[PDB]
Write a protein that binds this ligand. Structure first.
Ligand SMILES: C1=C(CCNCc2ccccc2)CCCC1
Ligand SMILES: C1=C(CCNCc2ccccc2)CCCC1
Lengths: 241, 794, 110, 55, 159
């Protein structure tokens, strides 16, 4: 009978959806990758002592990577962490192998450029078992980079130095410009690190790795400047809904 | 399979409790369904003999009796059962006894005469429910003995579920054989001695299907007493195994079936014309079964026929007139082995399920027919009398099943199990199970016994070694395998994320049956033939849903019948729309559908009680589609749907592909199903929108933006979304935002026309804009609206 | 992949599913696609055992019929009803009330 | 729904072990539902399962 | 590939994921933001007056020298940033630690994980069927009751 004909093309009655920060989207992706590998996620405080951020990682007080680490200090003991290491040092002391964790969080350094910010996010993985080898470090990292960029891309492992790993290495992916681009660092855990947490390097071994989240987010979604992440321009964030 | 425990312990009596035996049977692959006592609990009941029975002087029904129970004197008992004579041995519940239900026995008067006890029946003791009379005991019954010692009523009837494998465990011997190997005890078997023929008669028996019946044993028994009573020890052994007592002939065949697992049958010899012909039935041959129902058999079914007609279904069910009746005197005992592939399925094809077919289709011991035939003959004669002729043996040694010769290697043993079992413990277990084991270098080679039908490959021996060694004694070891990530695609859209959004918008997930009432579904989708279910669970659940609306709307009615008007629910599942070019003639797409009704919110002190309308449901759908980032490429077009209101229904298109519908249920369809008011429904094809846009960053302008509003008057039939898509497509260098903020219909605009208030936001990344190019770009959009919609500016 | 792997995986699964160090037994059973086969029980507060899982090492005829060599590869399978495990986990009495879809019943699982 | 809570829980249990979730149709033929599982036509599993048969 | 055991992890159904709470806020119109941990003490001392916060002796800037006592300083600072760019209506939230000096806490400073947000402007963007009304108290509490309803403990909540 009656024809209550309406126009169905008018915008609906709703409130527009919000999105997550592009760093959070990247963090949740990597957790979902290593989640399917048995890697538990660990969290810890952002203010640490010199032990959990330096000494326990085979970095004595005289080591250059400490004062020349662009580190924020409060006393001679308390500091803003430069790596999510205090949560991994504490886990290895609470349990014996096998261990398989990733430790995301914020870290703080003292440079501020287009390529550097005083605060940034870091994802650091760790696995400690019986037959962990350098061939495993290459496999689980080539697997990650192939899946993070969803492409069978060119990678290379390059010798580096970290006071808490040996052999140490940094990896690069073939940048879209023809040159290489440093993505993440890694290496087999140092026996002195395992020693002061109750693990014997003769029985067990392992490898750790670390990567910047703002680093991989700029490569993944094509972000130009690094200050755009912490300016929190709603027009910028609304692109990652 | 039900069996008595005391009967099982006659073959093997391990030194364990009953429940310790039940769990031991369970751990051998025979799940026990229950363990029940044979009778109710009571004491003070004894055997007794009536010495004198006379008529009650004041009750025509009753009888005044004097019963001796081995006491100092004779007890006076009153009983009103019709079978109360004088030479009877009865069960007497003396004074001080108590029966099930705390029925204490006290001295009292029954219609005047004294009674110092009670004569019992099977129902009064919790045995069965045969209340036709009192208990009639054999004449050999010891007087002073308790009924539990004479009848062995301290027994349990164990019920077990036997899987299609382990066909041997369908008799007392089969279960006792396996109980023996778990306790490593020998098996006590009763002495079954052949009877030896005393007469000459036989009859011609020819089998024309040797592949179906490799062995058939016939034996005539002349001059028996069909009406002979079944002895009590046999009535109880059958009753404790879930089989009622019928006639003395069928109780013998049922006794040997339960004791040895061998099915047996008895024909009437004098109604057999010519002889026995074990043959495949003619395609279409009819046969009247014992229950009176006829069966049009197939050529696949094996039958036991004579030279004229068919008499029974081979190893499944017996015929009506071919069986033993009440005036026959000469019977022919059938005891055969049938190939399981020749018996399986034929019983269910005719809706039959017998003790015989269930055992033949799983396999009976082919080295067992003679031992069972000799026991049935001896038990039949010692009950009904008569003389037995010779055994008619028609055996084809070729078509008999061959005992497999399997090799069990140490390699696969510890690979499939992961736990080392000593070779001394392996060889014993296989031998106790009846295998001829030949030990070797890290290997065994066993020959499966004749009664096992599930031993054909090397893995079958692994299950046998492990289940005797005990699953509860094998340790746990976490799987050591590879840690590989797999294929992830960021462009994928999680269905769980969409359900999460609907949960945060006020929707409850529901799950409805895939088959729905075709009466209701025809009202929602008329003229579309659905895939139907022959022989369904119900006629209201006999049509595969072609949409989730039939179940959704049925769910809102279910909840509206419970004083709940407001229902906001959604479901995800497959629809089943027939299609010729689809696999299996049916295309099964994953659909997302929902339905809302009632007020927009529950009653709130600051929220208006308004009924939900069309734009409430679309706003929820635009929130769903916003996850894909392709909301700019979604169009809502008004298209007819018989279940939806024509003026308020919309098809949902994505870059040209219609991905579903949204609208209010048609008010006529709303009148049916008695929906309490206006309801909104939608449905979406999930695989069409399960892919989202991966973000790519664009440079943000550091310069300010400029907003301009325009008033566009168009015809009322012109969709407003197409004007917005024209303003955003024409202006791409500068126009970054097109939003409609007001729609006016009334005084100021002619009837049939409407004015749209649209705001344009202009911005560039390289400079600041000025009114010269701002008004020029706005005029560029105004003219485009006049070329496509004949629009204007007011 | 061995029977010791099948027991350890489902023991981890049942304990994490019920969040309780509960008693569990493995008893042999039959499935045409497993050999050895088994059914996994747990003891509820009612005292009796409750079957929940079926499992077993994959039969070699199945690995054969797809293109896998049982002498080279092995593996176990398992299967379970979700309604039965939901009732035990949350205390649901009548099983039919899952598909009645009474909103008074579904609201308890927010 | 209370059973989807259960399924999502079990998926997250086996997700941490490398088990990838796979889905398929509900109307299957006889090979993928019986034959490929060593259940021939004469096997009682085609009837003790109590199956709905279209053809 | 790494060869290791497939052992399940510790799962507690009674746990509520911070990702589940962030997702719900996204469905209520909230945009996640991330701000710095150190803020301007002059702005923080007018939001939390008299509350001495942990200061950086040698910071990158005096405007980034005080470890935040709450996420409101960075959130409200982000609101002004977007409002200075023709964005009147912002609805944002953030998750992060706060730094409050506590002598009973490890290292004399307690670091608890917070969840804070802020909304302003109209309730909706300019919509053809929704009236321009500025957001009030019961709009933000409604989003909080939705967050607290995830725990099943909203009946044990007072305001
Ligand atoms: C390693 C760590 C500390 C740093 N995290 C890993 C990393 C590796 C290479 C580059 C950057 C980061 C925790 C204790 C065990 C060994
Ligand atoms: C196909 C399947 C699926 C059959 N159903 C699973 C199940 C297994 C064990 C016990 C109960 C249930 C089994 C492995 C080979 C390929």
């Amino acid at each position: 009978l009656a024809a209550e004909t309406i126009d169905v093309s008018l915008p609906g009655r709703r409130i527009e959806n919000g999105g997550l920060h592009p760093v959070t989207r990247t963090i949740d992706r990597i957790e979902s990758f290593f989640g399917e590998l048995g890697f538990t996620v660990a969290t810890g405080p952002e203010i640490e002592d010199d032990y959990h951020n330096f000494d326990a990682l085979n970095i004595p007080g005289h080591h250059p990577a400490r004062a020349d680490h662009d580190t924020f200090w409060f006393d001679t003991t308390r500091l803003l962490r430069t790596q999510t290491s205090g949560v991994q040092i504490r886990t290895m002391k609470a349990q014996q192998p096998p261990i398989r964790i990733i430790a995301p969080g914020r870290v703080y350094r003292n440079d501020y450029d287009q390529t550097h910010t005083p605060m940034f996010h870091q994802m650091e993985g760790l696995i400690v078992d019986t037959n962990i080898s350098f061939t495993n470090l290459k496999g689980t990292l080539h697997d990650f980079l192939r899946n993070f960029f969803e492409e069978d891309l060119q990678i290379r492992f390059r010798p580096s130095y970290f006071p808490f790993t040996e052999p140490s290495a940094e990896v690069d992916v073939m940048g879209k410009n023809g040159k290489w681009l440093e993505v993440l660092g890694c290496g087999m855990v140092h026996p002195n690190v395992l020693r002061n947490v109750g693990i014997d390097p003769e029985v067990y071994s392992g490898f750790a790795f670390g990567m910047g989240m703002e680093r991989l987010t700029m490569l993944r979604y094509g972000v130009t400047d690094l200050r755009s992440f912490f300016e929190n321009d709603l027009r910028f964030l609304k692109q990652f809904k | 399979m039900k069996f008595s425990e005391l009967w099982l312990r006659e073959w093997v009596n391990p030194a364990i409790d009953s429940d310790a035996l039940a769990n031991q049977i369970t751990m051998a692959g025979l799940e026990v369904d229950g363990v029940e006592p044979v009778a109710g609990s009571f004491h003070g009941v004894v055997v007794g003999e009536v010495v004198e029975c006379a008529q009650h002087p004041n009750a025509d029904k009753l009888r005044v009796t004097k019963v001796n129970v081995g006491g100092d004197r004779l007890l006076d008992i009153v009983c009103g059962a019709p079978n109360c004579r004088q030479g009877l041995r009865v069960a007497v519940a003396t004074i001080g006894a108590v029966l099930p239900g705390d029925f204490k026995i006290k001295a009292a008067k029954l219609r005047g005469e004294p009674s110092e006890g009670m004569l019992c029946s099977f129902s009064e003791l919790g045995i069965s429910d045969d209340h036709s009379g009192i208990i009639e005991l054999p004449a050999d019954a010891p007087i002073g003995t308790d009924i539990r010692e004479y009848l062995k009523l301290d027994d349990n009837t164990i019920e077990i579920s036997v899987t299609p494998n382990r066909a041997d465990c369908l008799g007392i011997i089969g279960v006792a054989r396996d109980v023996a190997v778990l306790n490593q005890l020998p098996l006590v078997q009763p002495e079954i001695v052949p009877v030896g023929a005393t007469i000459d008669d036989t009859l011609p028996i020819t089998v024309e299907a040797p592949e179906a019946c490799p062995r058939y044993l016939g034996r005539v028994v002349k001059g028996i007493n069909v009406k002979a009573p079944t002895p009590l020890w046999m009535k109880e052994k059958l009753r404790r195994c879930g089989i009622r007592s019928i006639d003395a002939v069928v109780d013998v065949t049922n006794y040997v079936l339960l004791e040895l697992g061998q099915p047996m049958h008895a024909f009437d010899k004098d109604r057999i014309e010519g002889g026995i012909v074990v043959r495949m039935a003619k395609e279409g041959e009819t046969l009247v079964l014992l229950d009176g129902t006829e069966a049009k058999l197939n050529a696949d079914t094996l039958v036991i026929a004579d030279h004229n007609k068919a008499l029974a279904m081979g190893g499944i069910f017996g015929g009506e007139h071919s069986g033993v009746n009440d005036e026959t005197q000469n019977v022919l005992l059938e005891c055969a082995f049938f190939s399981p592939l020749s018996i399986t399925g034929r019983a269910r094809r005719h809706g039959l399920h017998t003790d015989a077919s269930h055992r033949y289709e799983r396999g009976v011991d082919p080295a067992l027919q003679h031992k069972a035939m000799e026991r049935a003959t001896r038990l039949l004669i010692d009950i009904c009398g008569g003389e037995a002729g010779p055994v008619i043996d028609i055996t084809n040694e070729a078509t008999l099943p061959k005992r497999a010769t399997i090799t069990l290697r140490r390699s696969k043993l510890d690979r499939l199990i992961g736990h080392h079992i000593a070779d001394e413990q392996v060889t014993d277990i296989l031998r106790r199970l009846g295998c001829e084991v030949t030990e070797g270098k890290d290997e065994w080679q066993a020959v499966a016994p004749s009664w096992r039908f599930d031993m054909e490959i090397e893995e079958d021996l692994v299950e046998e070694v492990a289940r005797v060694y005990g699953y509860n004694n094998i340790p746990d070891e976490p799987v050591q395998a590879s840690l590989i990530m797999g294929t992830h695609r960021e462009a994928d859209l999680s269905l769980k994320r969409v359900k999460t959004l609907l949960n945060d918008k006020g929707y409850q997930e529901v799950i409805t049956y895939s088959f729905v009432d075709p009466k209701v579904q025809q009202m929602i989708h008329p003229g579309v033939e659905a895939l139907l279910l022959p022989s369904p669970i119900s006629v209201e659940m006999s049509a595969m849903r072609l949409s989730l609306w039939t179940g959704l709307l049925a769910t809102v009615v279910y909840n509206q019948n419970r004083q709940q008007n407001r229902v906001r629910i959604f479901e995800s599942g497959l629809r089943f729309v027939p299609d010729t070019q689809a696999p299996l003639g049916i295309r099964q797409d994953l659909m997302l559908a929902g339905v809302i009704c009632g007020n927009r919110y529950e009653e709130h002190w600051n929220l208006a009680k308004e009924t939900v309308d069309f734009y409430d449901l679309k706003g929820d759908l635009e929130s769903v589609l916003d996850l894909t980032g392709k909301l700019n490429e979604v169009e809502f077009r008004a298209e007819a749907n018989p279940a939806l209101h024509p003026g308020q229904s919309a098809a949902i298109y994505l870059k040209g592909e219609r991905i579903g519908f949204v609208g209010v249920v048609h008010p006529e369809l709303e009148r049916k199903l008695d929906l309490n008011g206006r309801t909104l429904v939608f449905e979406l094809e999930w695989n069409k929108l399960a892919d989202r846009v991966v973000p790519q960053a664009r440079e943000i302008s550091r310069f300010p933006a400029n907003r301009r509003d325009i008033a566009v008057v168009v015809a009322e039939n012109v969709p407003a979304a197409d004007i917005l898509s024209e303003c955003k497509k024409v202006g791409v260098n500068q126009v970054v935002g097109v939003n409609l903020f007001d729609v006016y219909r009334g005084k100021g605009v002619a009837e049939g026309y409407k004015s749209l208030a649209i705001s344009l936001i202009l911005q560039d990344t390289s400079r600041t804009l000025e009114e010269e190019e701002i008004a020029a770009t706005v005029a560029k959009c105004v003219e485009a609206l006049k070329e496509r919609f004949q629009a204007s500016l007011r």
